[PDB]
Design an enzyme around this catalytic site. Structure first.
Site, PDB file in Angstrom:
ATOM      1  N   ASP A 165       0.758  -1.249   0.000  1.00 18.21           N
ATOM      2  CA  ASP A 165       0.000   0.000   0.000  1.00 18.21           C
ATOM      3  C   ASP A 165       0.795   1.310   0.000  1.00 18.21           C
ATOM      4  O   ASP A 165       1.289   1.743   1.041  1.00 18.21           O
ATOM      5  CB  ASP A 165      -0.942  -0.053   1.208  1.00 18.21           C
ATOM      6  N   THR A 166       0.894   1.953  -1.163  1.00 19.65           N
ATOM      7  CA  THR A 166       1.631   3.216  -1.267  1.00 19.65           C
ATOM      8  C   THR A 166       0.912   4.360  -0.553  1.00 19.65           C
ATOM      9  O   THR A 166       1.522   5.376  -0.233  1.00 19.65           O
ATOM     10  CB  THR A 166       1.856   3.637  -2.739  1.00 19.65           C
ATOM     11  N   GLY A 167      -0.384   4.195  -0.305  1.00 18.36           N
ATOM     12  CA  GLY A 167      -1.138   5.236   0.378  1.00 18.36           C
ATOM     13  C   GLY A 167      -0.961   5.220   1.893  1.00 18.36           C
ATOM     14  O   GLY A 167      -1.376   6.152   2.581  1.00 18.36           O
TER      15      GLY A 167
HETATM   16  C1  LIG Z   1      -2.619   2.412   7.060  1.00 18.36           C
HETATM   17  C2  LIG Z   1      -2.073   3.606   7.810  1.00 18.36           C
HETATM   18  C3  LIG Z   1      -0.782   3.506   8.401  1.00 18.36           C
HETATM   19  C4  LIG Z   1      -0.226   4.593   9.108  1.00 18.36           C
HETATM   20  C5  LIG Z   1      -0.958   5.788   9.258  1.00 18.36           C
HETATM   21  C6  LIG Z   1      -2.241   5.904   8.680  1.00 18.36           C
HETATM   22  C7  LIG Z   1      -2.818   4.821   7.967  1.00 18.36           C
HETATM   23  C8  LIG Z   1      -4.184   5.004   7.376  1.00 18.36           C
HETATM   24  N1  LIG Z   1      -4.099   5.451   5.994  1.00 18.36           N
HETATM   25  C9  LIG Z   1      -5.106   5.220   5.131  1.00 18.36           C
HETATM   26  O1  LIG Z   1      -6.157   4.634   5.398  1.00 18.36           O
HETATM   27  C10 LIG Z   1      -4.852   5.769   3.706  1.00 18.36           C
HETATM   28  N2  LIG Z   1      -5.628   4.862   2.821  1.00 18.36           N
HETATM   29  C11 LIG Z   1      -4.934   3.852   2.206  1.00 18.36           C
HETATM   30  O2  LIG Z   1      -3.732   3.656   2.375  1.00 18.36           O
HETATM   31  C12 LIG Z   1      -5.719   2.909   1.256  1.00 18.36           C
HETATM   32  O3  LIG Z   1      -4.803   2.151   0.502  1.00 18.36           O
HETATM   33  C13 LIG Z   1      -6.639   1.953   2.041  1.00 18.36           C
HETATM   34  C14 LIG Z   1      -5.983   0.663   2.614  1.00 18.36           C
HETATM   35  C15 LIG Z   1      -6.994  -0.185   3.354  1.00 18.36           C
HETATM   36  C16 LIG Z   1      -7.743  -1.185   2.674  1.00 18.36           C
HETATM   37  C17 LIG Z   1      -8.697  -1.965   3.365  1.00 18.36           C
HETATM   38  C18 LIG Z   1      -8.911  -1.757   4.747  1.00 18.36           C
HETATM   39  C19 LIG Z   1      -8.172  -0.768   5.435  1.00 18.36           C
HETATM   40  C20 LIG Z   1      -7.217   0.015   4.738  1.00 18.36           C
HETATM   41  N3  LIG Z   1      -7.685   1.564   1.086  1.00 18.36           N
HETATM   42  C21 LIG Z   1      -8.955   2.066   1.127  1.00 18.36           C
HETATM   43  O4  LIG Z   1      -9.289   2.900   1.973  1.00 18.36           O
HETATM   44  C22 LIG Z   1      -9.881   1.530   0.090  1.00 18.36           C
HETATM   45  C23 LIG Z   1     -10.023   0.114  -0.037  1.00 18.36           C
HETATM   46  C24 LIG Z   1     -10.890  -0.446  -1.004  1.00 18.36           C
HETATM   47  C25 LIG Z   1     -11.613   0.399  -1.867  1.00 18.36           C
HETATM   48  C26 LIG Z   1     -11.490   1.799  -1.762  1.00 18.36           C
HETATM   49  O5  LIG Z   1     -12.206   2.603  -2.618  1.00 18.36           O
HETATM   50  C27 LIG Z   1     -10.620   2.394  -0.804  1.00 18.36           C
HETATM   51  C28 LIG Z   1     -10.533   3.915  -0.749  1.00 18.36           C
HETATM   52  C29 LIG Z   1      -6.598   5.663   2.001  1.00 18.36           C
HETATM   53  S1  LIG Z   1      -7.038   7.053   3.028  1.00 18.36           S
HETATM   54  C30 LIG Z   1      -5.317   7.248   3.463  1.00 18.36           C
HETATM   55  C31 LIG Z   1      -4.564   7.921   2.289  1.00 18.36           C
HETATM   56  C32 LIG Z   1      -5.218   8.144   4.715  1.00 18.36           C
END
Ligand SMILES: Cc1ccccc1CNC(=O)[C@H]1N(C(=O)[C@@H](O)[C@H](Cc2ccccc2)NC(=O)c2cccc(O)c2C)CSC1(C)C
Lengths: 99, 99
Positions: B25-27
């Site tokens: 996950d690059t996001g």
């Molecule tokens: C994971 C992590 C680690 C450290 C600090 C904050 C975070 C939280 N970050 C985040 O959540 C970031 N997100 C991410 O990194 C995304 O790749 C996220 C990963 C994920 C998938 C399934 C369950 C739970 C998480 N994916 C989704 O939210 C997601 C999943 C499926 C479909 C869809 O339309 C979306 C938007 C998108 S919003 C964001 C840019 C803030």
């Protein structure tokens, strides 16, 4: 180009002729963007994120330019922390992960 | 390797002696894994994304095995819906986005 991941992969995109910052997100199936005005009708959709599910407005066939590359696909409008460019559009610009 | 994004970029990883499936996950700034036991000390932390925030336990200097590579760094443990390998570890295996 090639984007390393030491910092957030934030790029500039263009939607409706307006510039915005977005995140290239390989962990998101869809593209989710902040509240903004878009053409045509929208349909309902629920997406599951790290904190739970949320409702978003789905607009299909929306023209969006990402770092110079034009794409035309589905964009979801809703309460998102960042404008996220998901796989549905990353594939359109031929983006891949490499290592 | 070059991973296309037609589908979720899932990989098998080994953490704390356990095998798990995870999403590249690059996001994600950091790596977050479902509830499990990890060695060493930890401190509470809140992380947010689509849907809101969840509380996780932060462990530093955790070793993870991913695609034949050995990476070391912080791992957050909590009620995440998906196990995700974030940038903090993606960089260590030389992951980049290309288009
Ligand atoms: C994971 C992590 C680690 C450290 C600090 C904050 C975070 C939280 N970050 C985040 O959540 C970031 N997100 C991410 O990194 C995304 O790749 C996220 C990963 C994920 C998938 C399934 C369950 C739970 C998480 N994916 C989704 O939210 C997601 C999943 C499926 C479909 C869809 O339309 C979306 C938007 C998108 S919003 C964001 C840019 C803030």
């Amino acid at each position: 180009p090639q984007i390393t991941l030491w910092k957030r992969p934030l790029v500039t995109i263009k939607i409706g002729g307006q510039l915005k910052e977005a995140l290239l997100d390989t962990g998101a199936d869809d593209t989710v963007i902040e509240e903004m005005s878009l053409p045509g009708r929208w349909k309902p959709k629920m997406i599951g994120g790290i904190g739970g599910f949320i409702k978003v407005r789905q607009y299909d066939q929306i023209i969006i330019e990402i770092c110079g590359h034009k794409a035309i696909g589905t964009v979801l409008v809703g309460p998102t922390p960042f404008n996220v460019i998901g796989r549905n559009l990353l594939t359109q610009i031929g983006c891949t992960l490499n290592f």
